Amino acid sequence: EEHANMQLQQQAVLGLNWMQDSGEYKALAYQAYNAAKVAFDHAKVAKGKKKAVVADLNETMLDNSPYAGWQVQNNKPFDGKDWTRWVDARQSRAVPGAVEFNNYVNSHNGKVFYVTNRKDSTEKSGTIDDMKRLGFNGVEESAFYLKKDKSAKAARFAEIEKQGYEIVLYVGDNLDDFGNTVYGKLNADRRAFVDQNQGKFGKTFIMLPNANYGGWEGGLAEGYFKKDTQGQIKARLDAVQAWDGKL
Amino acid sequence: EEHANMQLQQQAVLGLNWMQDSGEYKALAYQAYNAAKVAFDHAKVAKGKKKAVVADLNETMLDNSPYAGWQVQNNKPFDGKDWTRWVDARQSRAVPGAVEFNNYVNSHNGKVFYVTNRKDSTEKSGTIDDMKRLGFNGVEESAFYLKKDKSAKAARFAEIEKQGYEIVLYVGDNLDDFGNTVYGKLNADRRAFVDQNQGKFGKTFIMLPNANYGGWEGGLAEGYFKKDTQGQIKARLDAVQAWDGKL
Numbered sequence: 010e011e012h013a014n015m016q017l018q019q020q021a022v023l024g025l026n027w028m029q030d031s032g033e034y035k036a037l038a039y040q041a042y043n044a045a046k047v048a049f050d051h052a053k054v055a056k057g058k059k060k061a062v063v064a065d066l067n068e069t070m071l072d073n074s075p076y077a078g079w080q081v082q083n084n085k086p087f088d089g090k091d092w093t094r095w096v097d098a099r100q101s102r103a104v105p106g107a108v109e110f111n112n113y114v115n116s117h118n119g120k121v122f123y124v125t126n127r128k129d130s131t132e133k134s135g136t137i138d139d140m141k142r143l144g145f146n147g148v149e150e151s152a153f154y155l156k157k158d159k160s161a162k163a164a165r166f167a168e169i170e171k172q173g174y175e176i177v178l179y180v181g182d183n184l185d186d187f188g189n190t191v192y193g194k195l196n197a198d199r200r201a202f203v204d205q206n207q208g209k210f211g212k213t214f215i216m217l218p219n220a221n222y223g224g225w226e227g228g229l230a231e232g233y234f235k236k237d238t239q240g241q242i243k244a245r246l247d248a249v250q251a252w253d254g255k256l
Numbered sequence: 257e258e259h260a261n262m263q264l265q266q267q268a269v270l271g272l273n274w275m276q277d278s279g280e281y282k283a284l285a286y287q288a289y290n291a292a293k294v295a296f297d298h299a300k301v302a303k304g305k306k307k308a309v310v311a312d313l314n315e316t317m318l319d320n321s322p323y324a325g326w327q328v329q330n331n332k333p334f335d336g337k338d339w340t341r342w343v344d345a346r347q348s349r350a351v352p353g354a355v356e357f358n359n360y361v362n363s364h365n366g367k368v369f370y371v372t373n374r375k376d377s378t379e380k381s382g383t384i385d386d387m388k389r390l391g392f393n394g395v396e397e398s399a400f401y402l403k404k405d406k407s408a409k410a411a412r413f414a415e416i417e418k419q420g421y422e423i424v425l426y427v428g429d430n431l432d433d434f435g436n437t438v439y440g441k442l443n444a445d446r447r448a449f450v451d452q453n454q455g456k457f458g459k460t461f462i463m464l465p466n467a468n469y470g471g472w473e474g475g476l477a478e479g480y481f482k483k484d485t486q487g488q489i490k491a492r493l494d495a496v497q498a499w500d501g502k503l
């Protein structure tokens with residue numbers, strides 16, 4: 010149904026306005042990257058280890074909001090085939106503060122590795138071209154751990170550690186950018202993970218804001234991503250906590 | 257039109273799900289307050305001055321998401337008269353990390369002052385009752401600078417400084433919580449203010465995320481808050497930046 014597709018995407022409009030237009034979103038990005046620099050500078054690693062920073066790309070270092078905008082304007086729910094075309098369009102922007110932090114790490118005895126679920130086989134060329142144009146240093150192919158078979162990221166973090174690096178901090182907009190412990194889990198377990206790690210945020214886990222999509226969307230209901238459009242609309246509306254209007 | 261009221265509030269649903277349900281939102285709250293503690297501990301003030309922290313309430317220290325949820329469920333655009341009833345309902349929650357940071361400041365040679373546009377005359381009693389119940393220390397009436405005549409906050413910051421305090425940091429979800437320089441201005445000027453203060457975020461300006469409302473909403477278009485419901489919907493949709501779908 011086209012009506013359902015329209016309602017689903019209309020539900021993203023206000024958060025998209027916030028991410029695209031507000032100074033507040035920019036301030037949060039700068040806040041995150043300012044905190045990240047402090048954590049990096051403070052970090053000490055084991056003897057023999059090299060300092061690594063792990064960074065997610067989409068909505069962490071790369072700004073894909075125009076794809077979301079296209080979804081809104083065309084009543085288009087997410088489709089990986091449309092996403093691939095977006096990547097190939099080479100119109101990605103940079104999240105504020107990301108290039109500076111990236112380049113600072115790489116010039117101060119660290120290395121940023123990009124652990125990202127952009128696809129290695131079909132989305133790598135556009136990703137690298139955009140990042141070069143955007144001013145990121147260190148974007149040789151060896152810095153990238155793009156998605157091959159698995160969306161969960163922990164195995165790639167381990168690959169990095171096997172190369173002689175100690176990861177001093179992680180940057181992301183999705184809790185699954187910090188490990189696998191709540192990958193595919195509902196929001197109750199994900200909030201619990203955050204509580205169990207309260208002191209790490211702004212130190213070793215650096216958060217960027219993303220009100221448009223993510224593991225929290227799937228976390229709204231068991232089997233959310235398997236539901237049809239109407240089912241997803243209902244899951245979102247059912248998750249809403251509302252005042253009863255009484256005193 | 258009821259159809260317009262419904263569309264306007266439907267546009268807030270996804271960002272509301274994110275704020276209410278996601279671990280990511282909690283992580284951002286903890287990140288902000290972890291950073292705030294570091295800044296407070298580092299702060300030095302002029303001889304003779306007492307250390308003050310200025311904090312906004314709504315969506316900074318107090319969580320009002322159930323009011324937004326009620327708006328969604330009842331197709332109700334914002335109305336200060338409904339808001340007053342919400343305050344009186346005494347169902348406010350605390351933003352994660354806020355009580356701990358508040359109480360830490362107040363027990364470590366500082367004072368948090370609440371500079372908030374909850375209304376002094378009609379909304380003070382519910383505000384204080386909720387904050388007491390939520391566990392905030394230092395919520396005597398003298399800590400509060402609630403709205404009387406003016407929504408712009410700088411004059412109240414000055415009142416605090418005249419009492420012998422030096423403000424060491426500001427906490428908020430709205431750029432207008434940091435001063436008056438972009439109060440009532442459009443988002444271009446507000447983003448410019450953020451850029452001009454890039455290094456302060458996460459240090460002396462502490463940001464909390466709010467994808468549901470704020471000065472950025474009014475900032476979407478000249479005279480936004482004066483427009484009717486259809487006009488506001490059009491302003492939001494017109495602000496959207498969209499990929500053209502081409503390569």
Ligand SMILES: Nc1ncnc2c1ncn2[C@@H]1O[C@H](CO)[C@@H](OP(=O)(O)O)[C@H]1O
Pocket residue numbers: 065066067068073087092124125126127221222223
């Ligand atoms: N609406 C959306 N739904 C799922 N993924 C999206 C998305 N918008 C952007 N993405 C990105 O596509 C990859 C696979 O999930 C992820 O890459 P990252 O690991 O973040 O670099 C998404 O964020």
Ligand SMILES: Nc1ncnc2c1ncn2[C@@H]1O[C@H](CO)[C@@H](OP(=O)(O)O)[C@H]1O
Pocket residue numbers: 312313314315320334339371372373374468469470
């Ligand atoms: N949807 C909304 N629109 C305007 N204000 C809202 C709002 N939801 C909550 N508020 C709050 O009402 C006061 C006046 O603007 C502000 O208080 P604070 O200065 O943030 O404590 C709003 O955030």
Ligand SMILES: [Mg+2]
Pocket residue numbers: 065066067068069181182183
């Ligand atoms: Mg991401």
Ligand SMILES: [Mg+2]
Pocket residue numbers: 312313314315316428429430
């Ligand atoms: Mg506020």
